[model samples]
Structures are given as C-alpha cells and as structure tokens.
Target: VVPVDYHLLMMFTKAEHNAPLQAKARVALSSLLRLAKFEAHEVLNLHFVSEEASREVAKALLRELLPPAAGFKCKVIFHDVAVLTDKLFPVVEAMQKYFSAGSGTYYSDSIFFLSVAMHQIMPKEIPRIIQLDLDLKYKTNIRELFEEFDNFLPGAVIGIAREMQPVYRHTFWQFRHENPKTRVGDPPPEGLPGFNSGVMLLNLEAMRQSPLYSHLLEPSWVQQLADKYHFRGHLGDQDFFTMIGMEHPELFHVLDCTWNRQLCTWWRDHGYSDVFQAYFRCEGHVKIYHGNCNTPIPE
Candidate 1:
C-alpha cells in the first residue's frame, strides 16, 4: 500500500444547480472514476464549497459516483460558500468592476471570483490543490497532473492552460491595435491569448511567499493592470488572471493545451474565424476535454 494522497476542489453553489451543470459534473467525475488509476492505499480528497441544499445534492450525486468497489477511498468536504465569501469578497472587491459579469460589481456575483483569492480563503496548511471545472472529461490518469507541481519554478504560483479561444485577442483589441504585431492577442508559439481558468494548480505556499505576486492582489496593483490594458471583462477569475498575466507572465506556469483541450469555438463562428484555428488547435492527444460554453465533446 503506497498510501499516496491527492486532493481536488470544485465550487458547487446555488440551490438549483443547472441541468447541464449536473450533466457536466457527472461527466467530469465519471471520467476519473472510470479511468482512475491508483495504488491500494491511495485516497482522493474531494472538496466542495457549497451551501445547504446544494450540499445535499452534491453529496447524493457523489455517492452514486463512488461505489464500494471504487478503486480508492474518497474524502469529501463541504465548505459553506458563505464561510469564505464574507472575507474573500473584500480582498478582491476592487477587481470586480474590471472582471465581473457586468458594468457594476453586483455583490451576489462576487463569489464567481473566489478562485482568484483562494490562497487567502483556504488554510495555509493545505499547501497545494488542483481546481477543476465541471465540464471536463479526463482521458489521462488524473494523478499525472498532480505530479507537475514538482516542476514549478521558484516564482511561479499557479499552473494553468492558455485560453484556447481567441476571446482575449478580441478583449485586448485596443492594446493589440496600439502595439501591432504584439503577442497580447496573438496565437501560441509566441503569442499571449491569456488563459483559461478551467484547470488550475494553485501553489498556495509559494503564492504566500512571493511579495510581488501577493502585492498584485492589492487594489492599487489590480487597478494599474486594468488601466494599462483598459481591461474590462465579465468572466470573473478568468479575466482577472488574464489581465494580470499580461504584465507579469512569469507568475504563471503555462500548461500544454493537451492538458485542457477546450472545445468551445464560439469565436470561430464569430468575427475571428480567420485566426481561430491558430489558437484553437491542440496538436496532441486530448488528455482532457473541456466542454465549456455548452459545447459538446467529440466522440
């Protein structure tokens, strides 16, 4: 018995989880539950930040996903969203206008940015954790991903995949227009299309240690980045990380697209059909598929 431990987290709030939300969450877990690989003593820790009614639903759903014959013991935890949101919102309050869903920072929606301030919300003792979205279908041993944490360079605090869509190219339009031929919105191999927060590995300890990375979370620093790029967005943590990545790209360790092959091509059907393929293409096997934007995964 190896006795290895692995931990993962997800946000399951709102009493009425969507029909597709449940469908996707099942799909995400089914992939891991089915293709799961582990030693006899390995245990998977599942953490959810949800409230009352949603907690019951998640618990019931997870029970169905894990059977007595399941490969490993599972540790489940329910963190009432309110437990952390009250303290978390204030830390990222100023960033709401730049990255929130609308022109104004509606208080109820602040929970969406919880991932950005997670290091503060979670206990310092829990050093590292992987945050996953409900839309994923895992084709690789989920364990392989946790191993990448060992590769983090000194200054890198988060490990994330780049946004497969050209949305950042569209969002950073003014910046790209001013600095033509710049990588801000350009395709990979040299460009910076920002990031997709769908799959993230947060190194909380390093994040706590880095003065520069920690300072960026402060209101003034967040304000500076927003002003520099004239950044206004509606995608919560995705936008906040994308905006910060623009100036301090080193803080993040970019993951290969194979790890998080995003399937949303809404941009291709829109005005960016020309350059969509450049950003959308993931050359290797789809270790994981992210069916975001309600997009279907290929069979």
Candidate 2:
C-alpha cells in the first residue's frame, strides 16, 4: 500500500526585516490553513525555503498559525535557502544572464529561479510539488491545486497560469518587431502570451525524465533561444519559462487564469493602457489571489 502525500512549498525570505512581507506571509498561511482539506490517510506536507533569520520568524509564525488540533494530517519542513541555492545556482546560472536584471549573475538571485530546477534539488521521494509566492491568498481548498497534476498532458512538466497583463507583450517588443506575425507577445486565447509563476504545479518526476526539458537547461540551448527571440528579462524563472514556452508550447500545461488571478494593475496605468483589459480580464471564481507588484487583495 502506497501512502498519498501532497507537497506544497512557499518561498519566505528576509521576513526578519520586511514587516510588509511578514504580514503578507501571515495572511497567506492563515488563509491557506483555513481552506486546506485532505483525506484521513493523505498527508499535507508544507515546506518553506528560508534563511536563518527568516526561518526563525517562519517557525514562530507557524507556531501561532497552525491550529491547536487539526483533523487532517500535516507535517512542516523548513529547508535552508542556502543549501537549496547552492544546488540551484549551477543548474540555473546560464539562464540567469538572460532573465535577471543585474550586470552579472548574482548568487543571491539564484533563489528566484529555484522552481526552474526544483526537480533536481528536491528528493526523489517527493514526486510532485506546488510552489507558491508568499504574497498570495487562497480562496479554494489547497488539495484541489494538487489535482491539476493529473491533467498534465503527456509532455507537460509544469502547470501554470497565463500572465494576466501585457508585460510580456512589452518585454518581447523587439522580437515582435522582427516578426510581425509572431504570437510571442500577443493576447491570450490563441496568442503565446506567457505565464505567471505565482502558483505552479511542478511535476518533478516528469521533469527529471523529460529529455527536451533537460536540454533546454543547457547553456548553449538557452543562449540560442535568447539570441533567436532577442529576449532579455528581469523577472527570473517566469521569463525563462515564457521564452521557452513560445518555442515549445507542448512542454507545459496551461492553467486557467482564474487559478492565479493576479491583482496588480501597474500595467493598466502604464503605456499598455490601450490593450490592457484584453490581457487582464479573468472570468469565473479565483482559486488564488496574487498580490504582485505590491497590489492589495480583496476581502
């Protein structure tokens, strides 16, 4: 008899200093627990990737956040960000030059790309994991998020929602200029609009076995694509995934925008005010609310 375990992780760093993010983490965790549901034998494994100071803060928060007595089984694990980053840097370093904003690839920034190589960093026992941003609020049962893994197509290694803004349309303007008909920066439905990494279902087993995915991680392949698309981004893993998704759409399972209903309207006020609503619109109920760019979530 095999045990059923659902692994969910969140990145919580520098909370020792950032009061705003600390409060966000509190709400994120509290809302998550308030809505989480699991079977009697099924266990919910919660993992936090954090540094020393932030780890202590998370521990304290967890002590206060977790219910005094829970009916569903749960286990909490805190992974040292230092250890994970050490393992992540080399796997993601080559792509960093293309996705990061700095003059050079900084080791500290590797953590932002952790999800890109999580299959390589996490243990083999954990077959799947859902990585979440700290600045988020849950509206549906957390267990339902794990169910998305079953819907991954044959070649799909990750499940993510489309980016709910024209940010990529702006980022890929250079490439669009060269190929006017290309869908790299267009709006959704048929366009290759790009993805949001706020809520992701990572199929670690599929990633570890997919040859195409492994090849994309190579420096030379990454360079070829970057040069081909004229891509240079500052959004870390999301940019890399979006770039590759343009070329290999079959490699990912596109989640509905409602799953990651991003509330940031910075793009609306920016230059894309014209085509903003086309990309920003999301129908149906939102399962998760992403307060990106410091945007506030609703009640």
Candidate 3:
C-alpha cells in the first residue's frame, strides 16, 4: 500500500455572482466530499480565500459535501489572515489579501495564491499533498476516482479531457506554447492525452524541491519567465500549470479525462450527451467536471 503522506486539499479562490453557479458549486463539492470519504484519507481540507461571500459558499459546501458516515475534517484557511501576519511574503500573499478585501477579482490568479499559501502552512514533515480546484461539477462516481488515485503513488495524477474535445487539444497547445519544444510539430502524439490542472494530485515533497514551486511563489518571476518564453499570461492558472507540467514532465501521472470534464456550451455544441454516453459505455474512469451545463452558475 502507498504511504498516506498526502492530504486531499481543495482551494476556492473566488466565485462570480450567480445563484446557479453557487448552487452547482455546492452540489459539486458535496460530490467531492462523498468521494473523499470512500478513500478513507485522514484529512480533507478545503481552503477558501477569505471573503464574506465565500463564507456563505463555504458553509453551503460543507453542508452538501460532508458525508454523514465519515469523520473527515474540513478546514477554511483564511488567506488574508496569513498575509496580514506575514508582510514580506510573496505576491500571492498580497493578491490573496486584495481579493479578501473585495478588490477586482482574478479568479485563477487567486488559486495560484492559495497554492502558495498551502505550501506555506503544510508541515515540512509531510511528504505529499493533493490540491484540487473547488469549482468542478462532477458527473461520474467519485469512489472510482479515489480508487484510481489510491492505486497511483508519489507521482502527480492530473485529470485529462477526452480526446477530440474542442478545448482539450487547443487549450493544450495554447498552454504548451509556454514551452516551445513540447508543442505538436508535424503530428501530435497519437492518442496523446491532454490533462487538466483543475484537479491535480501532487507529491508535496517533490513540489517543495521543484523550481516551479519557487517560480509560482514570485509573480514577478513568473511574469519574467513567461516573457522570456514569449507566452501570454491571459490564461493565468492554466498557463502556469501547463508550464509546470512541461518543465517537470517526470513528476506527473495522467488520468482519464472523465475525471475533469468541462461541460460547457462548447460541449453542448459538440454533443455532450453522445460523448458522455460513449465514455460511460466503455465504463471508463470517471470523476468530476470543470463545470456542469445543467447547474451552470449565471454570469
């Protein structure tokens, strides 16, 4: 059996105003909590950027996500409090504080901040940690996803979007520009999977020693790195995460895309029901969605 050095952690940086989105987030979180329970992990901590609005969402998330049978502990780490206590901290600290203060929201950027905050609070003795984004709306069984993760080890396990999906290859290439050599040249790897960073299983020990962690800590440094590589920063979290994966290819273990589907208008345009049916028929691995069409958060 693999060691239990990691903790299942989720980060909710900020959410746009939309009753439906909030509702979907609540449902999605409940699903995640249910999945975590079956895994029997010691701790399941969901970190949120400290905001008055998030407090409400967090409560809803706990209410729905917490399973009655498990004693899994949930925590809300106030990013603002951590920042206020440590003035000399990195840009992530300031950005988190800005969001907590209700400044113009940078959704993905705030998550990057939370990642750093987690790294800061995580005890040095712990060997690994899994960090997930909290906005997913799942369609598949969570128990299965946890089983796959349990079987997988120290390597990072990322959820991949299905093949031939509109956003998968395009977003992969778009983010791949962060590293020129990794881009598909003549023909992309046949059956090559495009993984999503929305839900990542990371080895904290490896991450601590990684230069990507160091780069993520400094916003100015990340900007400099992006400029140096001629990649745009418009995609924020996706771009940074793709860059990390590219830079540390040896550290990741790719999982089925069903684990993190983005059920958006694009999916509908492309015929989601058909695609979902195909995967379901195959009894392929399944887990969460980046967002669900049925329970969309209003813009």
Candidate 4:
C-alpha cells in the first residue's frame, strides 16, 4: 500500500455578496468532506482566495466539515493580488505557503488560476496532485474512485462521461479551430477520447519535464483566435488545458469516463441510466454531476 500522504484542497474566488453561490459552495465543500470521510482522507487544508468573505467562509467550512475529534490540520490563506501587478505572485505565494506545511496537496482553480497552480505543482508534486474544478457536484463513491486510481499514476487523469459529449464537442470545436489539422471536417483521427478538465489527476514531475508546462505562462496566440470567434465565456479552463495536451501529447493519460460522469438531463435523454449504474458499481468512480442539475436513478 502506498502510504496515503495526499491532501485535498479546494479553492474559491471572491464571494462577498454572492450569498446563494456561497451557500452552494459551502454545500459542495461539505459534500467533498463527506466523501473524504468515506475515503478516510484527512483534509489537510482548505484555501480561499481574495474574497472579502473568504475568512468567514473558511471558518464556516471548518466548523461544518471538520469534526471536533478530527485532528486534521487546516489553514486559511488569504490571496491579496491588489498590490501585485504581475497577477502570478499572489498565486505563487499561496501555493508556497500550502506546500511549506509539508503536506502533499491537490486543488481546483479557475482557468486563469490553473496556470499558477500548474506552476506550483509541475516539477514537484504532479504525481500526487488531483485537480478538480468547482463545478463538480459529486454523486458517486469517492473511496472506490481512489481505490481504482491507486494503480496508475499518470502525468494527468481526465474525467469523462456519456453526458459530456456536448462538452467534448465544445472542446473539440475549440481544438479544431485552434489547430486546423485536428478538425472533424479535415479527417481528424477517430476514436480520440475527449475528456473534461473539470476533474483531473496530474503527475507534476512528468508535466514539469514536458514542454506544456512552459507554455502555461507564455503569451497565447490562440487567444487571438478565441477572441475572433467569441469562444471566450464557454470554454473556460477546458480550452486552456486542451491546448496544453495538444502541445505535449505524452504528458497526460485519459482515465475511464466513470471517474467523472456528468449527470444531467442530456445524459438522461441519451438513455444513460443503465450505463451510469454499471459505472457507479465501481467503488472508486466519482459520479460527477453538474451543479444545479438532477438526473434520474434507476428504479
């Protein structure tokens, strides 16, 4: 058994006036805590970014998620980027603080925030880091999911589901436009499994060794293409990471879609209830659901 040194970290942006969203965020974190408890994994740290109410939220999450008997260490790090014009310093500072505590860490960051996380994780702890986007409303057993993932530590693990085909299409469209050779109309390679960046396991050491890590901070000519087509708001982090994968094909491993299943109406429309159930049987599979959406379970 590989000694479990992994620490689960979730990152949130500013949330002062967004009470409803904040409440939902709390619920999401609570759900994560519940899953973590099931997996017997301690929450090493819970981090919040430059939100005016971050401290408050951190306190609330600790109170709700951490049991009185649970001796897990928790820290609330404030990211103040107002004084830094570079935009990357505060991110680096937060990560440095997290890592300095001597705990293996994994986190979810926004698309822009990912570059900072990548900078910190790459060359160091990619083999131990799991990056999950805040959008996941987990539905499956997390313990079982971890057990399944215990065998292979790849450069990166991507989550996919039957319902994510549209999401995949969105990603494919972006990739196609950015690189004309990969376009569907241009005889692109068939059977290439598209995965969502919302949930991924990254092997930092391999990523750091690859060329993709270097491009995270460089000027993106692809941004010009994105701006030209108005593909800005939708792609989010998916576009950025997809480009990273394209740039360095050997730096990632696509995991089974069961690890990150998108549970939505579209999935139901496509008759995925039976398929989902079979996948759900796997103890380590994470049933990732879209926030504010519901799916029908088998009767």
Candidate 5:
C-alpha cells in the first residue's frame, strides 16, 4: 500500500461572529467524520490558517471529531496567519490587488492570497497538500482523492475541479463574442469553462520544481495573461487559477465532477438558467458536497 501522509489545508480566521458559525462548522466536521476513510498507517496533518484564539477552538473541536482508534494518525497544526502572510505577501504581491476583497491589498488581506503561493509558502518537505473549504462534506474515501496524484500527467501541477456554473461564461462573454465560436467559458466536454477553488490538490514539490509554473508567477507573466483575457476579479486563488488555466490548461489535472460536486445554483436564476444546468449537472456518485452561497445540502 502507498504510504499515507496527506496534508489537508484550511483557512479559519478569528471572527467576532463565531457563535452560530461553530454549529455549521460542526456539521462540516461531522460529515467528514461520518464518511472519511484513509489507507495505510497514517498521519493526516490538518493545517489551518488561524490566529491565537481560533487555533485553540479548532483543536478542541477536532479532538471529538476523530473517532478513537482511528485508522489514520491525525495531527492538527495551526499555522499562524501572521507567519503565513509574512511568507506569502511578497510572493503574490503583484496579483494581490487583482484578487483581494478591497481596492488595494491591505496588510491583513495578504493572507487571502496564501494559496496562490502555497508551493513556496509551505516547506519543501510537504510535497502535496489538498486545500478544502470548511463548507464541504465528504462522501467518499479521502484516500481515493489523494490517489488522484497518480492520475496526474506530466506538467500538471495541480488537480482541481471545474466551476459548476457559467460565471466564467459571463466573465468571458467579451472574448467569446469576439471569437464567435471559441470554447472559452462554454460548458464542459467541449469548453474550458474555468476552475473551482473549493477543492485543490497542490503538488507543491512539483510546483517548486516546475520552471514554467514559477515563471508564470512573475509580474510580467501575470500581466500578460490578465491583459490577454481581460481578467480582473476579487476571488483570490480561484480567479488566478481560472485565468491561468485559460492559457495553460496543461498545468492542471481536471478532476472528476464527483470530486468537488458544487450544489449552489445561484446563476441558474440570474439570466443563465438556460445554460446553467449544463455546468451544474454532475453525473455518477458525488464524492463531496459543497454548500456554497448559504445553500442547504439535501438530506
């Protein structure tokens, strides 16, 4: 059996309104516990980006989240948001303003760009890591998800799922009109709609070694792509990942729709109902459920 040393990354910052949120957090945890399985003897290092107070709360909850005598060796590492931001700021400085929530990259907002530079931010020893949103519920063995690394072909640095919406179709409408028959933002099985960030398998070690991947992070490279695609957005890694993927689809190993089965259909009613189902319709078993936009998960 392949040795299991999976590192799962999550971002959980300190919030003044964590009261009701904990309940939802428990739901995400409970679902993971209910369905999560690992192969081989394991140390599943759970890495969370948080401050002092939130770190304590995470460990406390994670304690009961794991079943006693669990098949995997689990460890929680609370990486200080400050420390991570320090390492990530300069690396992603050029694109921070493009993807930040505000007009500019505030000192506090640098943390939002951490995932974009995760390959360099995290130590080299940790080769690959899977970053997931807290608003997710696992429906399949996590080991199977990790095994996707084997499916990755040469030059693929990340394994990610497609955005189950036509948001990109809207964003790239201009390009589509100009090209007239281009596949940009068109639905899957034919088009390159875009990427969803909820679940990402970052091959960090490969990211570090890939000269092209590193080169693309440069200011000039980002500028070229941004200008070429008319890309300017505020969704952080998702925006960058989606934009870069428009030019270099080879850098990503597109995962099965089942892997990150997004459930929200906000775009369906928002002028995109006609084509929304094409992006939203996922076949086969759902390996994970993502409840985005405050959408409720089905019972």
Candidate 6:
C-alpha cells in the first residue's frame, strides 16, 4: 500500500547570519515535532526554502532535533532560494511594483514573492503544501493541520486566516474613504478583514487550474485592481493575496482565526485601539500561535 505523503514548507533564508531567527526556528521545530503524529501508512515531508549557508545550519539543527527513534516516516528537502528565484522572477515581476516599497522590482526580491506564483513554481507531484512561518508555535498535531486541505471549497485555491490586526483597514484608508459603504477594510464577521500569511495552505492543483486565479496574476489585471483599491504596500505576497482576495473572495477559503492566531499588538498601541479588538479577538482553541512583529507567545 502506498503511504500518503504530507508536505509542509517554511522559509529559512538568512538564518546563518541571524542568530535570533535560528532561535525562533529551534522553538518552532521543537514544538512542531513534539506534537506531530502520523499513521503507519503516512509520511511527513518537510521542505525548506533556504540559501546554502542556512541550509547547512538547518541540516545540523534538524539532525539534533529529528532523531531516528522519533518513528514517523519523514523526509527533509531543501530547495535553494537562488534556483527558485530564477524560475519565479519573471512571473511575479509586475505585481512587485504594487506590493514592494522600492521604486522598481529588484530581481532578487522574487523569493519573497514566491508564494504568489507557487503553483507555477512547485512540481505537479506535490498537489498541496502548507507554508508556515518560523515564528509559529504549534499546539496541536501538525498532521491535523494538513487535513485542512480536504476542507477547501469548490473554488478555493488557498486557505489562510484573516489578519488579526487592522493593518489593512489602515492601508486601504483612501479606498475606504471614496467608497464609504464598501467592506474592503472593515473588521471580521461580515467585513472583508483581509488575510495574514503566517500559515497558508496552497492547493497547487487548484491554483494551476483556476482561470480566475491565473487572470489575477496578469499584469493588467493586477494593475487594475491595485488602482481600484488604492493599494500600495511592502508586505510582499500577503499584500498581493489580500488585494486580489478583496476582488475575488471565492478564490480563497478563509481559515478560522484559530489556525493562525496572530499575537501582534502593534495596531492596538498605535491608533486603532477603538476597533482593534474587533479584528484581534479569536475564540476557541488556537492550533497555531503566530508571534508576528516580534511579539511573545504564551506558555
């Protein structure tokens, strides 16, 4: 019998030079493996997008953290950032202007925008992969997180949680002003609160086949929507997904806030104290805790 393969990816670039990032990955990997469980007929595949130096660091780290006695069938694969960037640059160049802070698209910035065109970049064999951030703390089995793929609706190509802050509400201030009645940047429930990229389930097959999703990637279409929404930001793929999602909500399956329970309070302390809780509040159990913006995770 063929064992089911479950793939999970995390970006691990620049870790060799950054000690704090390595510290974060150590905690993330520890918590992840501690709660991870797989059946005998299943295998867990861990993929990392990293540079050579960081790959070396990750190799040593994994060796120390992942022991043979851990029992579950698993494989670790590292894809060189340079190689992926070569295949990604052209496809995501146009959208960079809208999402990046730079005046022009720097060719090397493609890796940061990789998730935007991951369907075209990743091999067809890997139909679905969950991309997670290194700052996350997993409280439940990672295997169950992969099960979220089965819950994707008819037209949903990606599954992601809503941004747990009013960052978008502040970003789309102009569009919100012109279209006062629009729900473009409103809080959750009935509002279009936008997405957070801390944890993302990329249905590669759905993304490849969805014409509407592909159309949104085109230069003219992306430009049209950016103009309509008065969008301009430097959050890379998160900005791209959030902008297009506002236009075509059907293309995405919004995950429960608990899946990516973000713990950043920057917006609350800034000027959004009045309405911050509306977006920040997430009830029930938190499967994954995202310590975004250097916020500390609870014990």
On a 0 to 100 scale, what is the lDDT of residue 251 in model 3? 44
Runs of candidate 1 with Cα error greater than 4 angstroms are: 1-4, 15-17, 68-70
Q: What ordering of candidates by lDDT runs from best to worst? A: 6, 2, 1, 5, 3, 4
How well is each residue in 166-239 modelled by candidate 5, as lDDT tens digits? 99999887788788888889999899889899899999988888888898899899888877887667778898
Error (Å) of candidate 4 at residue 173 is 4.9
Q: What's the TM-score of each model vs. the native? A: 0.95, 0.97, 0.61, 0.59, 0.94, 0.98
**Ranking 2 against 5 by lDDT, winner:** 2
Residue-wise C-alpha lDDT for candidate 1, range 1-299, written one tens digit per residue:
54776778888776364677777777888887777776768878888888888888888888898853446677888888887678877887899988877867677777778777778877776788889888899998888898889888879999999999899999998988888878897889899999998899988888888898889999999998888898888989889888888898988999999999999989898899889999998988778899989999876
Residue 32 displacement in candidate 3 (angstroms): 2.7
Question: Candidate 6: deviation at residue 34, Å?
Answer: 0.7
Give the whole-model CA lDDT for all candidates, comma-separated. Answer: 0.85, 0.90, 0.48, 0.44, 0.82, 0.90
Name the better of 1 and 3 by lDDT: 1
In Å, residue 1's CA in model 2 sits off its true spot by 6.9
Candidate 3 total steric clashes: 3
Better of 2 and 4 by TM-score: 2
Over 110-218, each residue of candidate 2 has an lDDT whose tens digit, in order, gives: 9989988999999999999999998999998888887788899899999999998999999899999999899898988888889999998999999999999999999
Q: Tell me the deviation in Å of residue 131 in model 1.
A: 0.5
Which tens-of-lDDT digit does each residue in 176-203 have in candidate 3? Answer: 5664555321122333323445666555
The digit string of per-residue lDDT tens for model 4 on 183-251 reads 221211333333355566554454555454544434443444334433332333444454444444444
Cα misplacement distance, residue 43 of candidate 5 (Å):
1.4
